[PDB]
Amino acid sequence: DGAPPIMGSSVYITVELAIAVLAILGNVLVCWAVWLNSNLQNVTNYFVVSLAAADIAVGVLAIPFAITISTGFCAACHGCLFIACFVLVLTQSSIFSLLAIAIDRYIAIRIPLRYNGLVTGTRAKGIIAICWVLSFAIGLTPMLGWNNCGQPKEGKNHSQGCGEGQVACLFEDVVPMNYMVYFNFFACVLVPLLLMLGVYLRIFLAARRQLADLEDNWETLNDNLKVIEKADNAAQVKDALTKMRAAALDAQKADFRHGFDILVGQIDDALKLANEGKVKEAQAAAEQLKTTRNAYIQKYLERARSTLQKEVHAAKSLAIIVGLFALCWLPLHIINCFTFFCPDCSHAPLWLMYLAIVLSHTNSVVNPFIYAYRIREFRQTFRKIIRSHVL
Ligand SMILES: CC(C)CCC[C@@H](C)[C@H]1CC[C@H]2[C@@H]3CC=C4C[C@@H](O)CC[C@]4(C)[C@H]3CC[C@]12C
Ligand SMILES: CC(C)CCC[C@@H](C)[C@H]1CC[C@H]2[C@@H]3CC=C4C[C@@H](O)CC[C@]4(C)[C@H]3CC[C@]12C
Ligand SMILES: CC(C)CCC[C@@H](C)[C@H]1CC[C@H]2[C@@H]3CC=C4C[C@@H](O)CC[C@]4(C)[C@H]3CC[C@]12C
Ligand SMILES: Nc1nc(NCCc2ccc(O)cc2)nc2nc(-c3ccco3)nn12
Ligand SMILES: CCCCCCCC/C=C\CCCCCCCC(=O)O
């Protein structure tokens, strides 16, 4: 006996087709927004586009291939291997794009004055092409001989009535589990995911250190200003001015040049007076500094804080994407670890296998939602496309 397999199969196929439709629609919208709006045309979004192209291919190719391989149909083993492994190419390309985004945002926060010269559109395109080539090589490695085509399941192949050179096309009969666990999961997925966690940690720490340094320079300027006011010795005001000059030159190195020239000029004026013994003439000259800091230094410090907060909010938005990739793909990899490392364990049931596959495919739908919710420039362009082109 047993429930007709077509019943559970019809649920699985319908759900896969629903995911395919949404993965295509949302990611086409991402590509159309970057094409239309020049504000979205930057190196970071070229990797966003490469990632959207990989998710479009999940809907157009990997999902029809997943439906085909679920039937266990008779096929030449290398044809079967191509259908089984093509999704691993798209997943590897997604990992390289995510890793590129992380390093791009790290270079922007650590060396912003050298960013536009080091990270160019031409260099990004070249990196995108190399990454797509490497993804085909990694994902299709079983086709080079690391496969179970040489050890066919004779009982399964006669039961389904396959011909000569043909196998019943089932993922776990043709793709070796040692490839899936050691090579694909540990080396190609887990290692870059941990590298990305490291890069994001370094982004947040760099921003936190840069923000604390800005605030320190600001309080150093205001503290020593009060030290000059409540002083009595010419060398006492001379020490507070020398400590202000250092904090002023460090704030400049982190219309703009005009405001700092007035400030450093005024410090140098009040310094020459203090060095000549004129303490009261120095203290009155230092009282003028309060007008310069309120008219130029407070505005520059506020704009530098706002830019850094924007980079932190943008780094968090992109980290959510890496987190959702990990959440959607880890169950399938973890199930494979149990199949491989625990031979005394019952194999995970069929319904759980197909639920883990469906969840990994759901990852190809989620990114356009993160862009729409967390990035204003994508959100506004999405609204323009829908309100005018669709409506
Ligand atoms: C460019 C896009 C639109 C076309 C993609 C081509 C796809 C559909 C082609 C290319 C290679 C093909 C496979 C090559 C070999 C075999 C072995 C055979 O025993 C059954 C069919 C099967 C498994 C083919 C199925 C279709 C296939 C996967
Ligand atoms: C739109 C343009 C650019 C792409 C056209 C792609 C063509 C070449 C693809 C799309 C679907 C493909 C077919 C899908 C299924 C099968 C059954 C298999 O047993 C042999 C190959 C065969 C018959 C494929 C041959 C090539 C095919 C017809
Ligand atoms: C949030 C995500 C990353 C964590 C989810 C982990 C999932 C994939 C884990 C948690 C508990 C796990 C199951 C625990 C028990 C068994 C029994 C064994 O005979 C086969 C594997 C199987 C069925 C495990 C498969 C993977 C499993 C379902
Ligand atoms: N283990 C596995 N199985 C399948 N499909 C076959 C599901 C199945 C498993 C056992 C069985 O007897 C019949 C069907 N797709 C799979 N995709 C992946 C994968 C992709 C990326 C990481 O893991 N692993 N994986
Ligand atoms: C920009 C588009 C990307 C084009 C890159 C494609 C180049 C393919 C490179 C390596 C593939 C290696 C896997 C071997 C495939 C075996 C083919 C076969 O005989 O079936």
Ligand code: NA
């Ligand atoms: Na992806």
